Scaffold this motif. Structure first.
Motif, PDB file in Angstrom:
ATOM      1  N   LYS A  27      33.054 -22.186  -0.212  1.00 60.60           N
ATOM      2  CA  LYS A  27      32.476 -21.002  -0.821  1.00 60.60           C
ATOM      3  C   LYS A  27      33.543 -19.920  -0.933  1.00 60.60           C
ATOM      4  CE  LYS A  27      28.568 -23.178  -0.527  1.00 60.60           C
ATOM      5  NZ  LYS A  27      28.867 -23.861   0.758  1.00 60.60           N
ATOM      6  N   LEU A  28      33.173 -18.768  -1.479  1.00 64.04           N
ATOM      7  CA  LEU A  28      34.069 -17.622  -1.483  1.00 64.04           C
ATOM      8  C   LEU A  28      33.601 -16.618  -0.443  1.00 64.04           C
ATOM      9  CD1 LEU A  28      33.534 -15.521  -4.755  1.00 64.04           C
ATOM     10  CD2 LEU A  28      32.159 -17.456  -4.160  1.00 64.04           C
ATOM     11  N   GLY A  29      34.534 -16.186   0.391  1.00 63.78           N
ATOM     12  CA  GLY A  29      34.229 -15.296   1.488  1.00 63.78           C
ATOM     13  C   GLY A  29      35.493 -15.067   2.279  1.00 63.78           C
ATOM     14  N   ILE A  71      37.260 -23.237   3.840  1.00 61.58           N
ATOM     15  CA  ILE A  71      35.811 -23.109   3.789  1.00 61.58           C
ATOM     16  C   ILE A  71      35.436 -21.892   2.957  1.00 61.58           C
ATOM     17  CG2 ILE A  71      33.715 -23.186   5.162  1.00 61.58           C
ATOM     18  CD1 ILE A  71      35.363 -24.063   7.497  1.00 61.58           C
ATOM     19  N   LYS A  72      36.208 -20.814   3.084  1.00 67.05           N
ATOM     20  CA  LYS A  72      35.979 -19.601   2.311  1.00 67.05           C
ATOM     21  C   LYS A  72      37.312 -19.008   1.887  1.00 67.05           C
ATOM     22  CE  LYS A  72      32.710 -17.328   5.067  1.00 67.05           C
ATOM     23  NZ  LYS A  72      32.418 -18.124   6.288  1.00 67.05           N
ATOM     24  N   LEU A  73      37.405 -18.587   0.625  1.00 67.34           N
ATOM     25  CA  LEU A  73      38.541 -17.815   0.137  1.00 67.34           C
ATOM     26  C   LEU A  73      38.044 -16.646  -0.696  1.00 67.34           C
ATOM     27  CD1 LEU A  73      40.865 -19.538   1.199  1.00 67.34           C
ATOM     28  CD2 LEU A  73      39.491 -21.057  -0.214  1.00 67.34           C
ATOM     29  N   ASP A  74      38.762 -15.527  -0.617  1.00 65.81           N
ATOM     30  CA  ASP A  74      38.547 -14.412  -1.528  1.00 65.81           C
ATOM     31  C   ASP A  74      39.629 -14.287  -2.580  1.00 65.81           C
ATOM     32  OD1 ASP A  74      38.458 -13.596   1.536  1.00 65.81           O
ATOM     33  OD2 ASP A  74      36.597 -12.853   0.630  1.00 65.81           O
ATOM     34  N   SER A  75      40.858 -14.658  -2.247  1.00 64.49           N
ATOM     35  CA  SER A  75      42.023 -14.349  -3.052  1.00 64.49           C
ATOM     36  C   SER A  75      42.783 -15.629  -3.360  1.00 64.49           C
ATOM     37  CB  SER A  75      42.928 -13.345  -2.330  1.00 64.49           C
ATOM     38  OG  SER A  75      42.999 -13.642  -0.948  1.00 64.49           O
ATOM     39  N   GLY A  76      43.954 -15.458  -3.952  1.00 64.92           N
ATOM     40  CA  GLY A  76      44.808 -16.578  -4.276  1.00 64.92           C
ATOM     41  C   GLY A  76      45.804 -16.185  -5.337  1.00 64.92           C
ATOM     42  N   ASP A 105      34.209 -13.785  -8.773  1.00 63.04           N
ATOM     43  CA  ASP A 105      33.034 -14.632  -8.940  1.00 63.04           C
ATOM     44  C   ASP A 105      33.476 -16.004  -9.421  1.00 63.04           C
ATOM     45  OD1 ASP A 105      30.446 -15.458  -8.914  1.00 63.04           O
ATOM     46  OD2 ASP A 105      29.774 -14.246 -10.612  1.00 63.04           O
ATOM     47  N   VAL A 106      32.540 -16.948  -9.402  1.00 59.52           N
ATOM     48  CA  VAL A 106      32.704 -18.247 -10.041  1.00 59.52           C
ATOM     49  C   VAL A 106      31.579 -18.398 -11.053  1.00 59.52           C
ATOM     50  CG1 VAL A 106      32.120 -18.922  -7.706  1.00 59.52           C
ATOM     51  CG2 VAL A 106      31.945 -20.595  -9.536  1.00 59.52           C
ATOM     52  N   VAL A 107      31.933 -18.729 -12.292  1.00 61.03           N
ATOM     53  CA  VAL A 107      30.997 -18.634 -13.406  1.00 61.03           C
ATOM     54  C   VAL A 107      30.757 -19.957 -14.112  1.00 61.03           C
ATOM     55  CG1 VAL A 107      31.252 -16.186 -13.862  1.00 61.03           C
ATOM     56  CG2 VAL A 107      32.901 -17.792 -14.800  1.00 61.03           C
ATOM     57  N   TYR A 108      31.605 -20.962 -13.919  1.00 59.41           N
ATOM     58  CA  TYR A 108      31.423 -22.224 -14.617  1.00 59.41           C
ATOM     59  C   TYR A 108      32.183 -23.321 -13.894  1.00 59.41           C
ATOM     60  CZ  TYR A 108      31.008 -25.607 -18.375  1.00 59.41           C
ATOM     61  OH  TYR A 108      30.714 -26.720 -19.115  1.00 59.41           O
ATOM     62  N   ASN A 109      31.644 -24.536 -13.948  1.00 62.91           N
ATOM     63  CA  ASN A 109      32.386 -25.707 -13.518  1.00 62.91           C
ATOM     64  C   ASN A 109      31.854 -26.922 -14.264  1.00 62.91           C
ATOM     65  OD1 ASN A 109      31.611 -27.967 -11.078  1.00 62.91           O
ATOM     66  ND2 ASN A 109      30.014 -26.561 -11.781  1.00 62.91           N
ATOM     67  N   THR A 152      30.819 -22.416  -5.191  1.00 64.65           N
ATOM     68  CA  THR A 152      31.815 -23.233  -4.514  1.00 64.65           C
ATOM     69  C   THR A 152      33.076 -23.319  -5.358  1.00 64.65           C
ATOM     70  OG1 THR A 152      31.279 -25.403  -5.441  1.00 64.65           O
ATOM     71  CG2 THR A 152      29.904 -24.592  -3.650  1.00 64.65           C
ATOM     72  N   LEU A 153      34.225 -23.225  -4.699  1.00 62.39           N
ATOM     73  CA  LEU A 153      35.514 -23.275  -5.374  1.00 62.39           C
ATOM     74  C   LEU A 153      36.048 -24.700  -5.339  1.00 62.39           C
ATOM     75  CD1 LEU A 153      37.079 -20.013  -3.944  1.00 62.39           C
ATOM     76  CD2 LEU A 153      36.126 -20.365  -6.214  1.00 62.39           C
ATOM     77  N   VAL A 154      36.271 -25.277  -6.516  1.00 68.69           N
ATOM     78  CA  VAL A 154      36.828 -26.608  -6.654  1.00 68.69           C
ATOM     79  C   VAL A 154      38.001 -26.536  -7.626  1.00 68.69           C
ATOM     80  CG1 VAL A 154      34.974 -28.122  -5.933  1.00 68.69           C
ATOM     81  CG2 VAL A 154      34.875 -27.033  -8.170  1.00 68.69           C
TER      82      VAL A 154
END
Lengths: 257, 171, 146
Positions: B33-35, B54-59, B76-80, B91-93
């Motif tokens: 997730k993002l956190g 498990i959680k990321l905010d940045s990159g 945010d995450v808007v599409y996958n 969820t970040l993939v």
RNA sequence: AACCUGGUUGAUCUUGCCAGUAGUCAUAUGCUUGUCUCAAAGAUUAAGCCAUGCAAGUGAAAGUAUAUAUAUAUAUAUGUAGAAACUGCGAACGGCUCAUUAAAACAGUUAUAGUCUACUUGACAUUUAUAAGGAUAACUACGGAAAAGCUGUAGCUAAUACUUGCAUUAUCCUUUUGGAUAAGUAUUUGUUAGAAGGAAUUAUAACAAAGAAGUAACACGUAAAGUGUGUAUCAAUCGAGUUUCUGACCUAUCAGCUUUUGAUGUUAGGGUAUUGGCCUAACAUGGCUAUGACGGGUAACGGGGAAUUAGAGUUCGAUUCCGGAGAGGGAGCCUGA
RNA sequence: UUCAAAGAAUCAUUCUUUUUAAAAUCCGAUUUUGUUACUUUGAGUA
RNA sequence: AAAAACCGUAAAUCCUAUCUUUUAAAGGAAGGAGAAGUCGUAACAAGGUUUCCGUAGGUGAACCUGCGGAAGGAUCAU
RNA sequence: AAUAGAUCCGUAACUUCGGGAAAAGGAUUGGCUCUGAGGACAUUAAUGUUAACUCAGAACUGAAACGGACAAGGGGA
């Protein structure tokens, strides 16, 4: 578990070790090192079964404890140390210099060499790898990495190596006139002049090698070792001089005595 | 957990000897997730460490038309392309489409180029409007479950048009 | 036009911004098709365009079915020697192959395929060259000596 | 050694089988047995059940010694050893068995341009210093439990256990020499350039971001400076995991199987050391089959091999070696290369 | 769907060698001309 | 650190269904072997109605009869 | 008295091959927040306006309960 095996059965040992069937149940598994197990002998059998200096493995250990025997002018104490295809073995107490070579029958023999010659080992470069900074390293059959090789050196060349300084002295190419010694085939131990090279795209490249008596034998490219140019071998050779003989006429010279 | 227990190519059932080996493995998934940044360590084969985020905010995020990477935060995450549950649960993939902060990119453009290497690329209006809004679309390019860090690049051009159409003849 | 399903394949190595379409040579005497060189499709598993490398062995076969996406079924016919009777028997077995869209394959065509890394549960081969071959009857009933 | 003989008839010639004959590294058993050499041996049935004892430990220069003992010039310096314990390495090898297993395992033949790899070998490193920190075993004292390779509390101390942390090099130019410029190993992301391979999204190089782990706060002594231990990366080596092609016994009184429960493929991802329906989501309807699929049987581990052979063949191979599998039956997991 | 002639050596015969259409190579001469099965030689063979 | 929850890996138990192997059984109906048993005479001779086939019906049993076949017939033949 | 609606799964002997059959026998079902699929209409291949309830899937939620009342087969030899 199923990790790495650490025992060698006697009958499973390489044939050229010449270990007898009834002489126990196990063979000395060579330690990992400069050479493959199949294309090398452990010095325990080198100086127990060949030189007969030691009668038992414990006597081999007795020899090795005192820092006497040197493999490539440096002291080796591991009992199952792979000596390898060609290199010098110096025994200081008896002051003798050996070069490990192949007889015409495909077996490892310690060939007497002089002190002057015991400084000139031959290494067959197997890879050329360029690392950071456009610096080139030659990986040889000895498992040895030589940095800063001359840019003319190719992947199947050979280089004369000085044991004291670990430096290249000169290189030898693979033309159709460069004499070579075959290392692992039916023709293991033969010395010839290379008649031709056939390079098959995507498969083993074959080379046909002409003997001294003009008999031609073919072999895989990976199983040869450039020894010299057409003039002469850069190293000394065993008494057969890499000349294999037909079995029907080896018998006649055996009988005449 | 890999290789066996399937049906043959013909559809036949293969009898199973050779109970499961360790090298088949199959670790459970990381639903990153993002956190607040938190990652765990996985000891893979050969004591090689794999960072399971498990959680990321940045990159890191790359403006590829300039080939410049700047660290920013994922808004945010808007599409996958995979399961639509992944965006809904955020969820970040690896191929996820996210919205990130574009202020570092705008400030870098102002600082180096002036105004608001191989310079003078002429930019594009569709990305310019997003910058003016302040939040920009990007595509992840790393594997957060493997490398432990979310990281990607700004989408532009035809792929940006494609994803914009796919997100919003539309609802 | 260049992509219809939910993706556009990035075509790793294409490069879009600086540079000075992406394609390779495959080697082994095979010529990269002009369709692969110039066309607009993108295939991650194409030998001339994708990441896959042809290494292993090269086999000739007869196309049996091209009715699943981008992969085809090749049947190889051969003679197996039965020692006791000192004669042969016809034998066969089919191997799934990936067929990049740069080739236009039809049932009955002979194709040469090169081994690649496993791309799916059953495929380990990629077509490299196609020559047309008119067929009469079911493609499985043909016996080509190759 | 490329072999036949008795038996149907009152007699005959055939077919045809029964019986005879010889071998068996083929088992049991009966009778008998003076020597020597050589040596298979609880596989067959019960991968049935197990009393007892042993089967993996390890310190000779080189981690940590006021348990303790000893010896030399005189409490001094050297030592020699050293129970226990911490630490390191090994115990994943070996040995046994053949239950499972029928394109599975195995064998020959490939690939790993899809990966991991301890010991060993060769190269060889980057963003308080006359030497930094606590905390623990052994031990001491008080204990509990019928019992166990059980252990509580309090007190101290070490270490190569655990943890912090101390220059310099390269490049540009006038042109030996003066100034000038720059500073992350693997790994991940984006944009590019590009000695070898058969083919590179290769080696490598540049730019923009992250960034592990390290580069000795450690121990003994060889030429009339060495070694041990440890450490990043590359390479070698000992191997391993997957992988290509081809090869198996009987059965059709097994003809259609697979596909909601992944079956075949595409796309994206997750996961893995890596590839892969290995798994997930969406999508498509594929995949195999009378050249025998799918099933069933095997008193089936496979091979190297064995018996019998004129040549073909037939039968066997639990069992010296290699590969696989298992540790009463399943499943799960820790440490660790 | 490309057939033969001529020349040295054992014993009387047998055996060895050269060319003889067309297209690209070398300034009168220099040299390759379907695929597979099959067959021959090798390589790699614990 | 106990403890709890949720995906997952999943032993084990139970129900149900199917399949495989073994097995009991009143009764029924075969085959083989045995003994000088009872009844007949079916076949082998034109076997005293030539034999045999397919099919159908009938009878204590062998068997009999109808239809169509064969000679392996008792006819190679005005 | 026992279920009994619907959806999904599974369904034997026997058979006049039509059946037996709702055989037998299993699972699910609420609420809420979502996701996906199924049409019609105009402009110079592409962009807007607009309508039914019908299925499928996923989170969350509750004293594990949901054909919540009503309605509604007991099966088998």
């Amino acid at each position: 578990g199923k990790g790495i095996k650490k025992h060698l059965k006697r009958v499973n040992a390489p044939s050229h070790w010449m270990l007898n069937k009834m002489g126990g149940q196990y063979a000395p598994k060579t330690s990992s090192g400069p050479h493959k197990l199949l294309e090398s002998i452990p010095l325990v059998i080198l100086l127990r079964n060949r030189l007969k200096y030691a009668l038992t493995f414990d006597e081999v250990k007795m020899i090795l404890i005192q820092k006497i025997v040197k493999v490539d002018n440096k002291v080796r104490t591991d009992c199952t140390f792979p000596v390898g295809l060609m290199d010098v073995i110096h025994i200081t107490k008896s002051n003798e210099y050996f070069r490990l070579l192949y007889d015409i029958k495909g077996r490892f023999v310690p060939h007497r060499i002089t002190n002057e010659e015991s400084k000139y080992k031959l290494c067959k470069v197997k890879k050329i790898l360029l690392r950071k900074g456009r610096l080139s390293i030659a990986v040889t059959h000895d498992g040895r990495s030589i940095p800063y090789i001359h840019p003319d050196v190719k992947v199947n060349d050979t280089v004369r190596l000085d044991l004291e300084t670990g430096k290249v002295l000169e290189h030898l190419k693979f033309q159709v006139g460069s004499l070579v010694m075959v290392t692992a085939g039916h023709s293991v131990g033969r010395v010839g002049v290379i008649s031709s090279i056939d390079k098959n795209m995507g498969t083993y490249d074959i080379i046909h090698v002409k003997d001294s008596r003009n008999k031609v034998f073919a072999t895989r490219l990976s199983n040869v070792f450039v020894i010299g140019d057409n003039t002469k071998p850069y190293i000394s050779l065993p008494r057969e001089k890499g000349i294999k003989l037909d079995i029907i006429e080896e018998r006649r010279n055996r009988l005449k005595a | 957990r890999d290789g066996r227990h399937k049906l043959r190519l013909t559809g036949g059932k293969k009898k199973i000897h050779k109970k499961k080996r360790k090298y088949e493995l199959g670790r459970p998934p990381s639903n990153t997730k993002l956190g607040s940044r938190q990652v765990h360590v996985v000891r893979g084969r050969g004591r090689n460490y794999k960072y399971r985020a498990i959680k990321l905010d940045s990159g890191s995020f790359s403006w590829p038309t300039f080939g410049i990477s700047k660290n920013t935060r994922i808004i945010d995450v808007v599409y996958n392309a995979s399961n639509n549950e992944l965006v809904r649960t955020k969820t970040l993939v690896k191929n996820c489409i996210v919205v990130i902060d574009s202020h570092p990119f705008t400030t870098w453009y102002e600082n180096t180029f002036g105004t608001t290497i191989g310079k003078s690329k002429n930019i594009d209006p569709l990305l310019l409007e997003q910058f003016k809004q302040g939040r920009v679309l990007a595509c992840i390019s790393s594997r957060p479950g493997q490398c432990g860090k979310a990281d990607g690049y700004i989408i532009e051009g035809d792929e940006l048009l494609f994803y914009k159409r796919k997100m919003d003849k539309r609802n | 036009d260049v992509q219809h399903e939910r993706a556009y394949q990035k075509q790793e190595g294409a490069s879009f911004f600086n540079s000075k379409r992406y394609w390779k040579k495959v080697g082994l005497g095979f010529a990269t098709p002009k369709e692969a060189k110039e066309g607009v499709y993108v295939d991650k598993k194409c030998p001339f365009t994708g990441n896959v490398s042809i290494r292993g062995r090269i086999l000739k076969g007869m196309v049996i079915s091209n009715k699943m996406k981008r992969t085809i079924i090749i049947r190889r016919n051969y003679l197996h020697y039965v020692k006791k009777y000192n004669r042969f028997e016809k034998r066969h077995k089919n191997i799934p192959c990936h067929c990049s869209p740069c080739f236009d394959v039809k049932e009955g065509d002979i194709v040469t395929v090169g081994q690649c890394r496993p791309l799916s549960k059953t495929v380990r081969f990629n077509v490299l060259h196609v020559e047309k071959h008119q067929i009469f009857g079911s493609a499985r009933k043909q016996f080509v000596l190759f």
